[PDB]
Each structure stands twice: as structure tokens, then as C-alpha cells.
PDB file of C-alpha atoms and ligand atoms in Angstrom:
ATOM      1  CA  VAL E 283      29.808   6.611  50.600  1.00 39.71           C
ATOM      2  CA  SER E 284      31.616   4.871  47.534  1.00 37.21           C
ATOM      3  CA  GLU E 285      34.457   2.575  48.613  1.00 39.06           C
ATOM      4  CA  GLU E 286      36.906   5.014  47.069  1.00 39.40           C
ATOM      5  CA  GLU E 287      35.917   7.803  48.723  1.00 39.92           C
ATOM      6  CA  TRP E 288      36.489   6.212  52.075  1.00 37.36           C
ATOM      7  CA  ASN E 289      39.692   4.167  50.926  1.00 36.54           C
ATOM      8  CA  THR E 290      41.065   7.939  50.805  1.00 35.79           C
ATOM      9  CA  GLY E 291      40.258   9.214  54.222  1.00 36.24           C
ATOM     10  CA  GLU E 292      37.339  11.448  54.657  1.00 35.24           C
ATOM     11  CA  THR E 293      36.343  12.186  57.761  1.00 31.42           C
ATOM     12  CA  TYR E 294      32.435  11.895  58.705  1.00 30.92           C
ATOM     13  CA  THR E 295      30.859  13.371  61.461  1.00 29.38           C
ATOM     14  CA  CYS E 296      27.318  12.390  62.483  1.00 31.04           C
ATOM     15  CA  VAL E 297      25.493  15.527  64.355  1.00 27.95           C
ATOM     16  CA  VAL E 298      22.838  14.426  66.191  1.00 26.35           C
ATOM     17  CA  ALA E 299      19.691  17.401  68.168  1.00 25.38           C
ATOM     18  CA  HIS E 300      18.192  16.033  70.971  1.00 22.74           C
ATOM     19  CA  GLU E 301      16.171  17.628  73.767  1.00 25.30           C
ATOM     20  CA  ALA E 302      18.551  16.317  76.272  1.00 23.18           C
ATOM     21  CA  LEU E 303      21.261  16.788  75.262  1.00 24.55           C
ATOM     22  CA  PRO E 304      24.129  20.084  77.053  1.00 21.60           C
ATOM     23  CA  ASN E 305      24.041  22.157  74.167  1.00 22.98           C
ATOM     24  CA  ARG E 306      21.520  20.690  72.420  1.00 22.00           C
ATOM     25  CA  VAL E 307      23.918  19.288  69.889  1.00 20.40           C
ATOM     26  CA  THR E 308      26.362  16.358  69.856  1.00 22.85           C
ATOM     27  CA  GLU E 309      28.123  14.848  66.953  1.00 24.71           C
ATOM     28  CA  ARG E 310      30.496  12.142  66.439  1.00 24.24           C
ATOM     29  CA  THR E 311      33.201  11.357  63.572  1.00 28.24           C
ATOM     30  CA  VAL E 312      35.251   8.428  61.811  1.00 27.37           C
ATOM     31  CA  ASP E 313      37.157   8.328  58.650  1.00 30.77           C
ATOM     32  CA  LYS E 314      39.717   5.127  57.223  1.00 29.05           C
ATOM     33  CA  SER E 315      42.308   4.785  59.872  1.00 29.25           C
ATOM     34  CA  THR E 316      40.354   5.854  63.426  1.00 31.43           C
ATOM     35  CA  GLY E 317      37.584   3.288  63.063  1.00 32.98           C
ATOM     36  CA  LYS E 318      37.761  -0.225  63.776  1.00 34.03           C
ATOM     37  CA  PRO E 319      41.801  -0.056  61.919  1.00 33.83           C
ATOM     38  CA  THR E 320      43.958  -2.989  61.338  1.00 31.42           C
ATOM     39  CA  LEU E 321      47.119  -1.238  62.092  1.00 28.04           C
ATOM     40  CA  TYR E 322      48.183   1.131  64.962  1.00 30.43           C
ATOM     41  CA  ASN E 323      51.401   2.869  64.644  1.00 28.46           C
ATOM     42  CA  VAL E 324      52.600   4.861  67.919  1.00 22.03           C
ATOM     43  CA  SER E 325      55.254   6.295  67.604  1.00 21.86           C
ATOM     44  CA  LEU E 326      56.068   8.379  71.441  1.00 21.28           C
ATOM     45  CA  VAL E 327      59.074   9.946  72.673  1.00 21.54           C
ATOM     46  CA  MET E 328      60.640  11.183  75.448  1.00 21.48           C
ATOM     47  CA  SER E 329      62.707  13.412  76.192  1.00 20.07           C
ATOM     48  CA  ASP E 330      64.351  15.310  79.211  1.00 20.70           C
ATOM     49  CA  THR E 331      63.743  12.482  81.361  1.00 21.03           C
ATOM     50  CA  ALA E 332      65.877  13.194  83.993  1.00 18.82           C
ATOM     51  CA  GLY E 333      65.077  17.386  84.072  1.00 18.33           C
ATOM     52  CA  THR E 334      65.049  19.285  86.880  1.00 16.06           C
ATOM     53  CA  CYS E 335      61.204  19.054  88.005  1.00 15.08           C
ATOM     54  CA  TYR E 336      59.761  21.093  91.575  1.00 12.28           C
TER      55      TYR E 336
ATOM     56  CA  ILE F 130     117.755  28.454  98.348  1.00 15.16           C
ATOM     57  CA  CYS F 131     116.234  24.596  98.902  1.00 15.49           C
ATOM     58  CA  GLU F 132     113.573  23.954 100.660  1.00 13.17           C
ATOM     59  CA  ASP F 133     114.540  22.306 103.387  1.00 11.44           C
ATOM     60  CA  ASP F 134     116.519  25.320 104.608  1.00 12.13           C
ATOM     61  CA  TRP F 135     112.780  27.137 104.635  1.00 11.18           C
ATOM     62  CA  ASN F 136     111.285  23.904 106.120  1.00 10.76           C
ATOM     63  CA  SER F 137     114.544  23.630 108.987  1.00 10.78           C
ATOM     64  CA  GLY F 138     113.969  26.246 111.387  1.00 13.41           C
ATOM     65  CA  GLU F 139     116.845  28.800 110.171  1.00 11.89           C
ATOM     66  CA  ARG F 140     115.665  32.561 110.064  1.00  6.42           C
ATOM     67  CA  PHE F 141     116.594  34.724 106.941  1.00  6.40           C
ATOM     68  CA  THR F 142     117.350  37.948 107.491  1.00  5.38           C
ATOM     69  CA  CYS F 143     117.063  41.512 104.784  1.00 10.34           C
ATOM     70  CA  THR F 144     119.115  44.055 105.652  1.00 10.45           C
ATOM     71  CA  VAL F 145     119.538  47.273 104.066  1.00  9.41           C
ATOM     72  CA  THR F 146     121.145  50.541 105.153  1.00  8.17           C
ATOM     73  CA  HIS F 147     119.864  53.928 103.488  1.00  8.17           C
ATOM     74  CA  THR F 148     121.594  57.011 103.243  1.00 11.58           C
ATOM     75  CA  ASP F 149     119.432  59.109 104.969  1.00 11.68           C
ATOM     76  CA  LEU F 150     118.249  56.461 107.279  1.00 10.02           C
ATOM     77  CA  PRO F 151     121.756  55.443 108.207  1.00  7.79           C
ATOM     78  CA  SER F 152     120.384  52.601 110.555  1.00  9.99           C
ATOM     79  CA  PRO F 153     120.055  48.704 109.622  1.00 11.31           C
ATOM     80  CA  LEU F 154     116.627  47.924 108.939  1.00 13.30           C
ATOM     81  CA  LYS F 155     116.453  43.829 109.877  1.00 14.41           C
ATOM     82  CA  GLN F 156     113.866  41.539 108.228  1.00 15.75           C
ATOM     83  CA  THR F 157     114.381  38.148 110.436  1.00 19.17           C
ATOM     84  CA  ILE F 158     111.621  36.318 108.440  1.00 17.41           C
ATOM     85  CA  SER F 159     110.684  32.115 109.392  1.00 17.55           C
ATOM     86  CA  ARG F 160     107.868  29.884 108.959  1.00 16.87           C
ATOM     87  CA  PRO F 161     106.025  29.604 112.134  1.00 16.41           C
ATOM     88  CA  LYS F 162     107.098  26.859 113.639  1.00 13.55           C
ATOM     89  CA  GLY F 163     104.379  25.897 116.275  1.00 14.26           C
ATOM     90  CA  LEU F 164      96.895  20.543 111.853  1.00 14.32           C
ATOM     91  CA  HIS F 165      94.638  18.777 109.255  1.00 14.35           C
ATOM     92  CA  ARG F 166      94.616  17.549 106.440  1.00 13.21           C
ATOM     93  CA  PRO F 167      91.934  19.148 103.795  1.00 12.22           C
ATOM     94  CA  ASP F 168      88.946  16.211 102.088  1.00 10.88           C
ATOM     95  CA  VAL F 169      88.816  18.195  98.612  1.00 12.95           C
ATOM     96  CA  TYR F 170      84.951  17.545  97.037  1.00 14.35           C
ATOM     97  CA  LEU F 171      83.946  17.614  93.469  1.00 15.90           C
ATOM     98  CA  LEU F 172      80.569  18.861  93.173  1.00 14.09           C
ATOM     99  CA  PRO F 173      79.374  18.383  89.719  1.00 13.66           C
ATOM    100  CA  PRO F 174      77.615  21.222  87.651  1.00 15.11           C
ATOM    101  CA  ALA F 175      73.684  22.076  88.971  1.00 14.41           C
ATOM    102  CA  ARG F 176      71.372  20.593  86.031  1.00 15.71           C
ATOM    103  CA  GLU F 177      69.544  24.113  86.080  1.00 16.00           C
ATOM    104  CA  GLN F 178      72.838  25.257  84.483  1.00 16.54           C
ATOM    105  CA  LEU F 179      73.106  22.966  82.168  1.00 17.14           C
ATOM    106  CA  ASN F 180      68.872  23.414  80.697  1.00 16.41           C
ATOM    107  CA  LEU F 181      70.268  27.201  79.803  1.00 13.48           C
ATOM    108  CA  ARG F 182      72.655  25.559  77.289  1.00 13.95           C
TER     109      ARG F 182
HETATM  110  C1  NAG P 416      55.793   0.141  62.701  1.00 11.79           C
HETATM  111  O1  NAG P 416      56.821   0.916  63.280  1.00 11.79           O
HETATM  112  C2  NAG P 416      58.109   1.688  62.798  1.00 11.79           C
HETATM  113  C3  NAG P 416      58.803   2.108  63.804  1.00 11.79           C
HETATM  114  O2  NAG P 416      58.155   3.383  63.496  1.00 11.79           O
HETATM  115  C4  NAG P 416      57.993   2.209  61.461  1.00 11.79           C
HETATM  116  O3  NAG P 416      59.028   2.611  60.700  1.00 11.79           O
HETATM  117  C5  NAG P 416      56.993   1.649  60.463  1.00 11.79           C
HETATM  118  O4  NAG P 416      56.267   2.195  59.590  1.00 11.79           O
HETATM  119  C6  NAG P 416      55.095   1.070  61.115  1.00 11.79           C
HETATM  120  N1  NAG P 416      54.846   0.307  60.283  1.00 11.79           N
HETATM  121  C7  NAG P 416      53.435   0.808  60.252  1.00 11.79           C
HETATM  122  C8  NAG P 416      52.376  -0.455  59.174  1.00 11.79           C
HETATM  123  O5  NAG P 416      52.390   1.831  60.980  1.00 11.79           O
HETATM  124  C1  NAG P 417      53.905   5.034  60.316  1.00  8.91           C
HETATM  125  O1  NAG P 417      54.496   5.930  61.209  1.00  8.91           O
HETATM  126  C2  NAG P 417      55.396   6.331  60.682  1.00  8.91           C
HETATM  127  C3  NAG P 417      56.048   7.782  61.435  1.00  8.91           C
HETATM  128  O2  NAG P 417      55.264   8.685  61.500  1.00  8.91           O
HETATM  129  C4  NAG P 417      55.459   6.532  59.513  1.00  8.91           C
HETATM  130  O3  NAG P 417      56.589   6.875  58.771  1.00  8.91           O
HETATM  131  C5  NAG P 417      55.282   5.239  58.369  1.00  8.91           C
HETATM  132  O4  NAG P 417      55.022   5.063  57.610  1.00  8.91           O
HETATM  133  C6  NAG P 417      53.814   4.752  59.162  1.00  8.91           C
HETATM  134  N1  NAG P 417      53.425   3.543  58.641  1.00  8.91           N
HETATM  135  C7  NAG P 417      52.358   3.819  57.886  1.00  8.91           C
HETATM  136  C8  NAG P 417      52.218   2.469  56.757  1.00  8.91           C
HETATM  137  O5  NAG P 417      51.851   4.712  57.364  1.00  8.91           O
END
């Protein structure tokens, strides 16, 4: 894939079919931001941490 | 009155006679002479009640 088409985003999926896979088919995916990135941007927020929990 | 008077032990009488009922009706009132102290706790609102917003 041309380098302009990868630095946009563009999720690609690889589907394989084989006689020992569960539903006979599996698939993976990658884009610019998931696979081997140079930037990990977590942003987590916890809220109502006291709460009333049973 | 003054509050030492009701606190004293002296009784207080309300004396009324009526026309049809000629006899005086004595109401003799006093505080019952003859003790612990309270322990005020203050309990704060539940968490459930505040989660109703
Ligand atoms: C890094 O995290 C901060 C805090 O949320 C955020 O404002 C900033 O944009 C992030 N930078 C990158 C490069 O992800
Ligand atoms: C990192 O994440 C924050 C929150 O979503 C976002 O505002 C920020 O722009 C991100 N950084 C980059 C470089 O996109």
C-alpha cells in the first residue's frame, strides 16, 4: 500500500481460512495507530470512586 | 414569672368560678420535684440518598 494511503489511517484486515480454525475463518487487523505506534495516548478517568457498592 | 419561681417548688393555682358552677375549680400546678444528660450524635446523609441527585 502506498505510503500516503497508510499515513491516513486505513484499517487493513488479513483473513485466513483453514480446516482447524473454529468457524473455519479468522482475521486480524492493523492501521497506523494500533500496530507498532510511536505514541501511546491513554486518557483514563475514574469517577464516583466511593459509590455505594454491593 | 421568673424561671426560678417555677424551678423553686412553689405551686401555682388557677382559680375560676362559674355562674352555673358556683364552686371554685382549683388547678394547682407544679413541676414534678422527684436524671441523665443526652448524647447528641449527628448522623450524615447516606451515599444512596445522594446518588439520587
Ligand atoms: C499527551 O497527553 C496529554 C494529556 O491528556 C494530551 O493533552 C496530549 O495531547 C497528549 N499528547 C499526545 C502526543 O498524545
Ligand atoms: C491524545 O489524546 C487526547 C485526548 O483524546 C487528544 O486531545 C490529543 O490530541 C491526542 N494527541 C494527538 C497527537 O492526537
